[PDB]
Structure 1
Amino acid sequence: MAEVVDLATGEKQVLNDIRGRYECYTDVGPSFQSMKQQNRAEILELLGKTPQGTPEYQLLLLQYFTLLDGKGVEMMRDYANKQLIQMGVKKPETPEEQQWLVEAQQAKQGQQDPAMVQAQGVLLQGQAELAKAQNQT
């Protein structure tokens, strides 16, 4: 890799940051306890107003992903994640995520689409066999 973007700053000594500040205008909306709270509900809003189509399911998984600790939530949130990365959309946080998943993950579509070509070569080998028929003639 030789490209990157979107890193944070320290701004060492006390009291400093660019004077190109105000990038955020002020609106209002239901009060939330925290951020994770808002994201959670913001998805629920997105559900219902959406059909049982595909985009729905992601929201869903996204939902389990956002859930906070528990015997229940952990296991499912964990599945939800696994699923999402393997959906290829997640783009791992990488605490490990990629390894266990992205592996077997990359392995299947590859396998198949790549095995189909290995055998697709046999589709040409069939052509090659017909060619053999020509050679036979």
Structure 2
Amino acid sequence: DLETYVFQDNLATAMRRDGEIYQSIVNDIYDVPRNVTITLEDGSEKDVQLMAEVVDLATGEKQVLNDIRGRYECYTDVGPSFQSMKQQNRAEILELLGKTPQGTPEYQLLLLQYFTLLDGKGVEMMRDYANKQLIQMGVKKPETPEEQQWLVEAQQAKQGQQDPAMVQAQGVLLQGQAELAKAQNQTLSLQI
């Protein structure tokens, strides 16, 4: 590849070491929330993001509480450099779009997922439209009451659709059933 590949690899090794040191410092200083699911019958897959903090009650300073069992459960790796968690998701969606062939439902889902991730207020029409489409297709789950309103509206609108061929075939079947009923009536007419 490039002429500086060995230096790039050495920098990657140094970055892995830096990531390890940063992970240790975060585990010893910050407040990492623990993810737990209630698994309630009414609510499925609820990521509560439980946190645990206790005050000394003798001084204003706080005290951290990090479990030892769930400290080291994510390894460090080397990748491209971004600036926020939204840019990473945008890049992954772009990569998946590149790998997904056109004329496929997955392509439409990826397009809508990309569109619902923009930032500027000028582009708000498309973000709202993409969110509405994703919610009405049932792929996403509503959060705020207007979203459940959209979902129930889509549910009501879905049942309105009728296939003309189904209705015509039903009419033909009803005609046949009526002919059979006429034959059975003719039997009783013979019986007198």
More deviation in 56-65 or 39-48?
Answer: 56-65
1:105/1:115 CA distance change after superposition, 3 Å: farther
SS at match of 1:83: helix
TM-score by length of 1: 0.65
- Matched pairs, number: 137
- Over the aligned positions, Cα root-mean-square deviation in angstroms equals 8.1
Structure 2's unaligned 5+ residue stretches are: 1-50, 188-192
How far off is 1:130 after superposition?
3.3
Q: Could you say which structure has the greater relative contact order, defined with CA pairs below 8 angstroms and 6 or more residues apart? A: 1
Structure (1 or 2) with the larger CA radius of gyration: 2
Structure 1 stretches (4+) deviating beyond 4 angstroms?
Answer: 1-13, 113-126
Deviations 1:38-60 (A, max 9, x none): 11110111112221132343344
Matched-pair contact (CA < 8 Å) for 1:43–1:63: yes
Deviations 1:41-94 (A, max 9, x none): 101111122211323433443344433343542111111111112211112234
Identity %: 100
Matched-pair contact (CA < 8 Å) for 1:65–1:80: yes
1:73/1:39 CA distance change after superposition, 3 Å: same
1:111/1:56 CA distance change after superposition, 3 Å: closer
Distance, in Å, in 2 between the alignment partners of 1:13 and 1:49 is 47
Q: Is 1:27–2:77 an aligned residue pair?
A: yes
Distance, in Å, in 2 between the alignment partners of 1:84 and 1:90 is 6
